[PDB]
Design a protein around this nucleic acid. Structure first.
Ligand SMILES: [Mg+2]
Ligand SMILES: [Mg+2]
Ligand SMILES: [Mg+2]
Ligand SMILES: [Mg+2]
Ligand SMILES: [Mg+2]
Ligand SMILES: [Mg+2]
Ligand SMILES: [Mg+2]
Ligand SMILES: [Mg+2]
Ligand SMILES: [Mg+2]
Ligand SMILES: [Mg+2]
Ligand SMILES: [Mg+2]
Ligand SMILES: [Mg+2]
Ligand SMILES: [Mg+2]
Ligand SMILES: [Mg+2]
Ligand SMILES: [Mg+2]
Ligand SMILES: [Mg+2]
Ligand SMILES: [Mg+2]
Ligand SMILES: [Mg+2]
Ligand SMILES: [Mg+2]
Ligand SMILES: [Mg+2]
Ligand SMILES: [Mg+2]
Ligand SMILES: [Mg+2]
Ligand SMILES: [Mg+2]
Ligand SMILES: [Mg+2]
Ligand SMILES: [Mg+2]
Ligand SMILES: [Mg+2]
Ligand SMILES: [Mg+2]
Ligand SMILES: [Mg+2]
Ligand SMILES: [Mg+2]
Ligand SMILES: [Mg+2]
Ligand SMILES: [Mg+2]
Ligand SMILES: [Mg+2]
Ligand SMILES: [Mg+2]
Ligand SMILES: [Mg+2]
Ligand SMILES: [Mg+2]
Ligand SMILES: [Mg+2]
Ligand SMILES: [Mg+2]
Ligand SMILES: [Mg+2]
Ligand SMILES: [Mg+2]
Ligand SMILES: [Mg+2]
Ligand SMILES: [Mg+2]
Ligand SMILES: [Mg+2]
Ligand SMILES: [Mg+2]
Ligand SMILES: [Mg+2]
Ligand SMILES: [Mg+2]
Ligand SMILES: [Mg+2]
Ligand SMILES: [Mg+2]
Ligand SMILES: [Mg+2]
Ligand SMILES: [Mg+2]
Ligand SMILES: [Mg+2]
Ligand SMILES: [Mg+2]
Ligand SMILES: [Mg+2]
Ligand SMILES: [Mg+2]
Ligand SMILES: [Mg+2]
Ligand SMILES: [Mg+2]
Ligand SMILES: [Mg+2]
Ligand SMILES: [Mg+2]
Ligand SMILES: [Mg+2]
Ligand SMILES: [Mg+2]
Ligand SMILES: [Mg+2]
Ligand SMILES: [Mg+2]
Ligand SMILES: [Mg+2]
Ligand SMILES: [Mg+2]
Ligand SMILES: [Mg+2]
Ligand SMILES: [Mg+2]
Lengths: 393, 46, 159, 122, 210
RNA sequence: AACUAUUCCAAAAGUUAAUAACUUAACAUGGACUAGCAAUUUCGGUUGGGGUGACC
RNA sequence: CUCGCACACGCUUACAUCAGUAACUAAUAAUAUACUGAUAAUUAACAACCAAUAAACCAAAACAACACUAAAACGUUUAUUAAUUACAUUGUUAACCCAACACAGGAGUGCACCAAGGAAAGAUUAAAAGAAGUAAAAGGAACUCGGCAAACACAAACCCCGCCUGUUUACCAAAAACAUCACCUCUAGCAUUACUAGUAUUAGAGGCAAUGCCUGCCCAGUGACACCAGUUUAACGGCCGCGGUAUUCUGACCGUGCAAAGGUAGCAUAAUCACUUGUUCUCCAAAUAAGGACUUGUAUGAAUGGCCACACGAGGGUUUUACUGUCUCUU
RNA sequence: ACGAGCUACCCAUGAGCAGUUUAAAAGAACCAACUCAUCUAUGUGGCAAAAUAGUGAGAAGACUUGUAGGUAGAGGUGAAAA
RNA sequence: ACCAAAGCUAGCUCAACAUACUAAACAAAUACAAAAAUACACCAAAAUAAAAUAAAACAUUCACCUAACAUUAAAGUAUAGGA
């Protein structure tokens, strides 16, 4: 084979030992007594160094099997920056749900109702777009890590302004950089989603179930799509150290127990750093299932069974120009079998909130052909976002 | 063009080319230092 | 290293010429050490082994200026020390074989204070002497206690 | 061609070259890139109380000096250890094996301030 | 300087290219496997175009064949058979299992060594005959190579066939690729110049006869 | 001459039948061969100024 | 009149206050940022110093929506352990550096054309000669090697040589020299420092120059493969005499000799030995100039490339108008 | 022995190119910053051991340029000017 | 009459004797880019001296040419040398 090491760039082998050491029953004379190198004397062989009192920083790193939580079974862990290849297919397979193209009819009815809109909707959203893309920074061209949390927080403020007409939005709160762990078994391999989120919305009251029993029964005879040469494991991180304990970021007796919306941010300049949209959808499927499974095992217990009360978790993934929307309904804990009831997931894909933005006025043949501001606008994306925020009330 | 300005000063280049450490990494520079000591130089190197 | 004339005529070109010995990688068995050493050797060295009737015989019979090797001096020092100490670690299971090996080389037996210096260079000898004479300095308390005890014994024996 | 006779100083070099003037370090670089100073490396100054202590920095001119006898190891032994050793030998209780009762210490590493490694600065 | 006329090129990242076509993930299952081709991209290091190939829990960049496209299925095997195999354009098979008139690329020299020969864009060798458990192929330099029949080779011609017909517009493109201009020294031609007609050199054999 | 590519012989490792024949993985020594890369040295004198022609 | 402010690099107290200058420094005084003496000074938030070990990562920066080729610097989260505890150290001046000098030279980056920086004249007189500028009757290149320089012009064509952008003799030569795309030869079947982390559509050693028409003959010598025969010129290189003939001039032709073949296509008094200012036409009033023709050039000639061609050139020569102190002839 | 702080060529790490014409960031075009030095005049112990003034060529690339490293004289380097 | 001139000392040179030979100062920092207390290493090495000159050139050769063996003679002898 072709080994990927280079003989020069690798660390050198030790020099071959002096011929005095090969003589049996002979004491070598070395320069260890004068504690410095001397030509003509043999090189001394020292035992491996043993610092009898231990130091934290300057000691060697302990091995991985020395850790108390080390186990022989390799668990596959999903964190924030893991990428999935066939992202929707791997998400549907490892999550055991069914993909639905539209948002639910309750969500569309909430969006399309004219009574649920703000005062001057188009004016405030266009001003929010201009504020995020151009106005909020001293520089002429703000970077994406600046304008993406700004546009997300501005949309959260815009849908938060509805609390005077609907005084049930005060049952919610935002949370940051929490520790999430959800471990389960899916067809003889051990999976675990573990890490953090960008910003997570929680509420006092749970979200009502959104899918009908006819949809649940028609989900039963749905066959999961399979893909042969790639294993569904691929893209996750192999780990031999973990804990089999479902850990949400909130402890017992928390006044806001049920998460209502997750928010996913892609804040990076370069194209290879940001997620592909399929990878972004996969990330929201598996994180939303992690939060939903944390809910449905904290409220029910470690036994694996179908859920008579479904758990509904929503999420919004954001690039800063192009949005993805998810409503995920969890119905089933016993994911070891492939024949039982599958859960549900509604995904709106690639909702463009604006086409392009011009930060500086473009001039062709000494006249202004296009003015400052965003080109193209679709308010249906904001309508879906507002329905996803207002779904509790 | 115009000449006389071949010396563009840089302390990094000066201490890396004519430094004490650079003199003592090579036996020839060591012999340079011994010749300067035998002559009795006030400054052996830079 | 030397000079030579091309075509063996005196009036021809003077040429710098190096002559190098032919080298071979051969393994040699020493009966005293019971070890196989992979030593780069010469055909003259092998001829001298065959003439001196043994590898051990060749090392113990040919002196320093004929051997000219620090490895050869170390080998001679090791086996001469082995013969001087008469160590049981040659063959722990076969005393008859051990006596049979040491019977043949009894002509070169030299005592212990002589046998451990034959293969040492000057720097190794200086380091060995410094290590043997390496003493921590005695505290002046011990010297003063011995002086005071001598004074007290002299005062006690004078009464 | 610069100045060879001038001493090499942190004032002379670029922003990269930062050399101390001889002070002692009091800490290390922590987690956030900041400097974490160790209180244990700080030289705790040891001061007595001088209010109830009577002495002056200048000596009376009429006060006589003395014959200069430098302190000697023999004199220190004869003043400190010799009465105890002489008393124990005249009483028969002298022990050559154990000298710890007379002020002698076999190994320095037991005590707080060593002498040959010079553990204490001043 | 040991090789003249190299330098001043564009910044290039190097892609880790896996040359061994048959590489199982784990030693528990040493059987033949089947992988999926995701994308075919340009590589600045070589004249060929490479392809990302995923199977199991790993991906490898391999050298792409002529019509390998996005989302393809490629079979790698070591199984030699007396009914041979029906060779597609993607499959990797040992030379003992291939038919007689097979066009091949990425030819492995020693069993287990890895693919070394026939790597440039558009170049393909051809299997000639299989005698006494030994394969003989013809290289793009029209030289016969004698190899053990269990060496794995990939059937087909390397992609980017029109690399030979690619025209360089200017000296600026040569400096973009990194080829410095030749020296201005006028050297008179010696006896080495001229149209040398030489007979074909004999078959180069890597089968060690005991 | 050194060095770099060949080739041959010797050295070296060995294999054959009851002395002769044959082979050389990487180094590697000695003596030769073919070439490159090259090493040292020089540009006889008269000339109605040198060069050409001529002469010694 | 406008090279300002600051930072990086570099210099090393030359900076600031007070006092002195007979003399030393300013190429001269006045006094002082450039001499003398004493005393003080630049205070960190800015900058330096400022964790590794495993793993998920193919998907450019160009307002980046999405694309092109030459394939592109710039980091996250997951796990393991990272002394835990106010105040660490270092650079903070300047009118400054490299040029022997207080030198009309050289000097990287960020914002400005002034809101900041400075002074061409030491005082007279207004000779010649010299440098720079402005203006000029009539004429408009008649001056000169050349329309060099200058000008109210800032245009239109023909050649030579190189295709072109580019590069070179730093300090006398920027070109017709070199390189270059394209076209050709040779030499190589291959693994851990070049070539190359490549594999004959590849990589080196070279030649000639894009493109278009083409590249005629020869292995006799000298090289190179073959280790002797034999093969090679897009290898080093070479490609004929003598004599007579058709209605003169010439020679389609023939005789004979030597060679490896006897210079083919093309072009041509040319950047092409000398004759030469070869002969003729146009241009001019006049031309050894220039362009177009004739052409043995007995020493042109085909990748040491031959011919033409668009575009190109601070290259080398020509003509037309326009323009002018170049000049008549200076003021 | 000492020299690649100038220069010749590379390896890193960075930084600049405004306006105008065009489907074009096309080794296109006008012209700044910027880089060279075509021609002329001064200068010739000069401002200067190669400069000043006018005029010129490129100016999105085979372009300049900051910092740092490397190649050393039987040599290095060279779009050959010895 | 200016500019100028004059000293006798600092100190060196050659030997001899002579212990036996890298002086003085080391409180701190010194081979990070020397004079900067403080962290998981790598460390190290040898291969003939050559030529300018003389042989009126220059090829074999050319005393001394950084290898302790001294003086009186043998002796500028035998020998070695494009002899
Ligand atoms: Mg100088
Ligand atoms: Mg100096
Ligand atoms: Mg500094
Ligand atoms: Mg500084
Ligand atoms: Mg702090
Ligand atoms: Mg490459
Ligand atoms: Mg390629
Ligand atoms: Mg070429
Ligand atoms: Mg050439
Ligand atoms: Mg000689
Ligand atoms: Mg010569
Ligand atoms: Mg002569
Ligand atoms: Mg003469
Ligand atoms: Mg004459
Ligand atoms: Mg005369
Ligand atoms: Mg003659
Ligand atoms: Mg200075
Ligand atoms: Mg003055
Ligand atoms: Mg300042
Ligand atoms: Mg004046
Ligand atoms: Mg005048
Ligand atoms: Mg005038
Ligand atoms: Mg005028
Ligand atoms: Mg006039
Ligand atoms: Mg005229
Ligand atoms: Mg002009
Ligand atoms: Mg004109
Ligand atoms: Mg004109
Ligand atoms: Mg040109
Ligand atoms: Mg040009
Ligand atoms: Mg150049
Ligand atoms: Mg010049
Ligand atoms: Mg030019
Ligand atoms: Mg010039
Ligand atoms: Mg040319
Ligand atoms: Mg052609
Ligand atoms: Mg041509
Ligand atoms: Mg030809
Ligand atoms: Mg021939
Ligand atoms: Mg022939
Ligand atoms: Mg013609
Ligand atoms: Mg002529
Ligand atoms: Mg000719
Ligand atoms: Mg030729
Ligand atoms: Mg010619
Ligand atoms: Mg063109
Ligand atoms: Mg030009
Ligand atoms: Mg022209
Ligand atoms: Mg007048
Ligand atoms: Mg350097
Ligand atoms: Mg440099
Ligand atoms: Mg521009
Ligand atoms: Mg251009
Ligand atoms: Mg132009
Ligand atoms: Mg230049
Ligand atoms: Mg100028
Ligand atoms: Mg003028
Ligand atoms: Mg221009
Ligand atoms: Mg050279
Ligand atoms: Mg030349
Ligand atoms: Mg010449
Ligand atoms: Mg001579
Ligand atoms: Mg001579
Ligand atoms: Mg000599
Ligand atoms: Mg003789």
């Amino acid at each position: 084979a072709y080994e990927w090491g280079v003989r020069s760039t690798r660390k050198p082998e030790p020099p071959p030992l002096d011929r005095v050491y090969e003589i049996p029953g002979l004491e070598p004379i070395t320069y260890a007594g004068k504690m410095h190198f001397m030509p003509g004397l043999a090189r001394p062989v020292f035992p491996p160094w043993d610092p009898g009192w231990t130091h934290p920083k300057f000691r060697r790193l302990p091995p991985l099997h020395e850790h108390p939580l080390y186990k022989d079974q390799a668990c596959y862990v999903f964190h924030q920056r893991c990428r999935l290849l066939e992202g929707v297919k791997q998400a549907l397979w490892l999550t055991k749900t069914q993909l639905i193209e539209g948002l639910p009819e309750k969500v569309l009815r909430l969006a399309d109702d004219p009574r649920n809109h703000i005062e001057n909707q188009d004016e405030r959203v266009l001003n929010a777009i201009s504020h995020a893309r151009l106005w909020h920074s001293t520089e002429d061209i703000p970077k994406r890590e600046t304008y993406c949390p700004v546009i997300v927080d501005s949309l959260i403020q815009l849908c938060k302004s509805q609390i005077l007409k609907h005084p049930s939005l005060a049952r919610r709160i935002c949370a940051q950089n929490n520790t999430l762990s959800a471990t389960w078994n899916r067809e003889s391999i051990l999976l675990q989603v573990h890490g953090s989120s960008g910003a997570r919305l929680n509420a006092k009251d749970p979200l009502p179930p959104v899918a009908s029993q006819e949809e649940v029964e028609a989900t039963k005879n749905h066959v999961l799509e399979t893909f042969y040469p790639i294993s569904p494991t691929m893209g996750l991180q192999e780990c031999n150290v973990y804990d089999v304990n479902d850990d949400t970021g909130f402890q017992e007796g928390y006044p806001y127990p049920c998460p209502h919306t997750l928010y996913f941010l892609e804040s990076a300049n370069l194209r290879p750093r940001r997620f592909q949209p399929d990878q972004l959808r996969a990330k929201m499927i598996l994180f939303a299932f992690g939060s939903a499974l944390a809910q449905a095992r904290l409220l029910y217990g470690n036994d694996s069974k179908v859920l008579e009360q479904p758990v509904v978790v929503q999420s919004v993934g954001t690039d800063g120009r192009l949005f993805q929307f998810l409503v995920l309904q969890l119905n089933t804990t016993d994911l070891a079998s492939d024949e039982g009831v599958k859960n549900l997931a509604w995904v709106d894909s690639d909702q463009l909130l604006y086409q392009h933005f011009w930060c500086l006025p473009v001039i062709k043949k000494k006249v202004v052909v296009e003015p400052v501001g965003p080109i193209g606008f679709q308010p249906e994306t904001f309508r879906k976002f507002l329905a996803l925020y207002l779904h509790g009330a | 063009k115009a000449r006389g300005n071949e010396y563009q000063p840089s302390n990094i280049k000066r201490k890396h080319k004519h430094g004490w450490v650079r003199r003592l990494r090579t036996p020839t520079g060591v012999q340079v230092i011994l010749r300067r000591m035998h002559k009795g130089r006030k400054s052996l190197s830079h | 290293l030397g000079h030579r004339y091309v075509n063996n005529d005196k009036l021809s070109k003077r040429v710098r010429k190096v002559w190098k010995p032919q080298l071979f990688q051969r393994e040699l068995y020493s009966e005293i050490l019971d070890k196989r050493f992979t030593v780069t050797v010469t055909m003259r060295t092998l001829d001298l082994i065959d003439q001196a009737c043994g590898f051990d015989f060749y090392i113990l019979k040919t002196p320093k200026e004929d051997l000219c090797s620090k490895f050869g001096m170390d080998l001679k020092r090791g086996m001469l020390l082995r013969l001087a100490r008469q160590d049981p670690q040659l063959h722990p299971d076969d005393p008859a074989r051990r006596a049979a090996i040491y019977d043949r080389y009894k002509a070169f037996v030299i005592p212990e204070a002589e046998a451990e210096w034959v293969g040492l260079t000057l720097d190794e000898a200086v380091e060995k002497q410094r290590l043997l004479e390496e003493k921590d300095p005695i505290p002046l308390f011990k010297i003063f206690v011995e002086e005071l005890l001598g004074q007290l014994q002299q005062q006690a024996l004078s009464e | 061609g610069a100045d060879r006779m001038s001493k090499w100083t942190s004032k002379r070099g670029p922003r990269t070259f930062c050399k101390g003037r001889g002070a002692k370090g009091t800490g290390f670089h922590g987690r956030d890139g900041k400097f974490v100073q160790i209180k244990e490396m700080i030289p705790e100054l040891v001061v007595p109380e001088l209010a109830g202590f009577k002495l002056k920095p200048y000596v009376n001119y009429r006060a006589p000096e003395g014959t200069d006898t430098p302190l000697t190891a023999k004199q220190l032994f004869l003043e400190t250890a010799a009465p105890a050793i002489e008393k124990d030998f005249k009483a028969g209780t002298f022990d050559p094996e154990h000298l710890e009762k007379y002020g002698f210490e076999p190994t320095q590493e037991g005590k707080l301030f060593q002498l040959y490694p010079k553990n204490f600065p001043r | 300087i040991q090789v003249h006329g190299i330098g001043g090129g564009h910044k290039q990242r190097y892609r880790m290219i896996d040359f061994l076509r048959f590489r199982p993930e784990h030693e528990s299952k040493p059987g033949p496997f089947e992988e999926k081709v995701i994308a075919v991209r340009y590589d600045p290091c070589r004249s060929a175009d490479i392809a990302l190939v995923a199977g199991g829990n790993r991906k490898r960049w391999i050298i792409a064949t002529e019509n390998m496209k996005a989302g393809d299925t490629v079979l790698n095997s070591d199984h030699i058979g007396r009914m041979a195999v029906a060779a597609r354009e993607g499959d990797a098979h040992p030379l003992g299992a291939l038919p007689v008139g097979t066009l091949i690329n990425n030819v492995e020299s020693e069993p287990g060594r890895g693919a070394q020969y026939i790597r440039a864009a558009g170049t393909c060798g051809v299997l000639l005959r299989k005698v006494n458990g030994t394969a003989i192929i013809q290289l793009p330099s029209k030289r016969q190579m004698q190899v053990l029949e269990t060496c794995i080779a990939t059937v087909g011609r390397v992609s980017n066939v029109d690399h030979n017909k690619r025209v360089i517009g200017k000296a600026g493109r040569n400096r973009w690729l990194g080829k410095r201009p030749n020296s201005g020294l006028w050297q008179r031609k010696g006896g080495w110049a001229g149209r040398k007609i030489r007979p074909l050199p004999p078959m180069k054999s890597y089968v060690k006869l005991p």
